[PDB]
Write a protein that binds this ligand. Structure first.
Ligand SMILES: COCCCn1ccc2cc(-c3cc(-c4ccccc4)cc(=O)n3O)cnc21
Ligand SMILES: COCCCn1ccc2cc(-c3cc(-c4ccccc4)cc(=O)n3O)cnc21
Ligand SMILES: [Zn+2]
Ligand SMILES: [Zn+2]
Lengths: 176, 176
């Protein structure tokens, strides 16, 4: 039903040299309550808060989370922004002020109509031990590692309900 | 209002040692037409198609795009999957078979009600030269670099309408 491998490659062009230093820097998700999101991403997932930016006229804050050593965060405020925003693979959480206190408000995770965004995914050394720890911490699951046909791969959800895939790259090929 | 820097830090925890090797591997977006999406991400953005996986019973294809040298892609199939799925900062595009032929179908970019996911962002050496080339290539813009308040920061759109931030970490706007 889909493209063949050769048809897909027929649509691919070699990377133009003007793009050689481009990097996929961030994925932005809006979060209802930053206190709950910061606790989940740092305590449960082990990410580090590398930069916090506040925009008082726009009435929002940005929280940059990444798998980085906090000791690599520069001291100078200008060098800190240039370093945080040049890290690959960051998660940018947007807090629109006041959502945490609004009962009628909630964000949409993209996995039910209207669909679009699906998930972020974390590569781990051991899906089963990571998931046993998530169960112990009361994390909500979308798919446990041994549920469904795709055994050894899981999906959990964050406080806003966004999906997070948990995968071990060294054990994926046997699923084909 | 927003959180203070100290209040945000109090919500954070140091990383449990069992998460020390976790990495943010992928961001998944559903795409209506893989031919259009592959052309955009490779020719316009300069990403490389590092892995394509087809699931005949799930009725979908997965395309993994990343800023990687095509010469680093392994030759053998199982080695290829383990390498592609262990790269940081990949973009996973999901093609649910048949959407390209459904005139009434379209994905939602998360930027209009109901909101959630907002965008991916690419860090570039210079926003102006990057955007000059995007203009020459007929890319659709949400925000040109000098439109509105924040200068030197742009937002473009992919073929499904997902927003893509174009930023230069060395030339970000001054924070209040
Ligand atoms: C509970 O509903 C969850 C969504 C449906 N669903 C179930 C399993 C599954 C795996 C992949 C999947 C497979 C793979 C994969 C598997 C084997 C080899 C190579 C890639 C990579 C990947 O990123 N993803 O997301 C994608 N959707 C999946
Ligand atoms: C087209 O409407 C888009 C939504 C509203 N909007 C306008 C400008 C703008 C910049 C950032 C922004 C600023 C920054 C930033 C700016 C200065 C210092 C540090 C971070 C990082 C970042 O990832 N983003 O997304 C986020 N939303 C922004
Ligand atoms: Zn952003
Ligand atoms: Zn995935």
């Amino acid at each position: 039903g889909g493209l063949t491998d050769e048809a897909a490659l027929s649509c691919c062009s070699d990377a133009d040299p003007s793009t050689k230093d481009f990097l996929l820097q961030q994925t932005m998700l809006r979060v209802k309550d930053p206190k709950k999101s910061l606790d989940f991403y740092t305590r449960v997932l082990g990410m580090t808060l590398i930069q916090k930016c506040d925009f008082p006229i726009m009435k929002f804050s940005l929280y940059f989370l990444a798998y980085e050593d906090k000791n690599d965060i520069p001291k100078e405020k200008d060098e800190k922004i240039a370093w945080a925003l040049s890290r690959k693979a960051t998660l940018e959480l947007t807090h629109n002020w006041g959502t945490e206190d609004d009962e009628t408000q909630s964000y949409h995770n993209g996995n039910s109509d209207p669909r679009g965004f699906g998930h972020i995914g974390i590569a781990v050394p051991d899906v089963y031990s990571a998931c046993k720890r998530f169960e112990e911490l009361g994390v909500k699951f979308v798919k446990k590692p041994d549920d469904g046909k795709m055994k050894g791969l899981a999906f959990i959800q964050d406080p806003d309900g966004y999906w997070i895939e948990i995968l071990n790259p060294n054990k994926m090929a046997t699923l084909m």
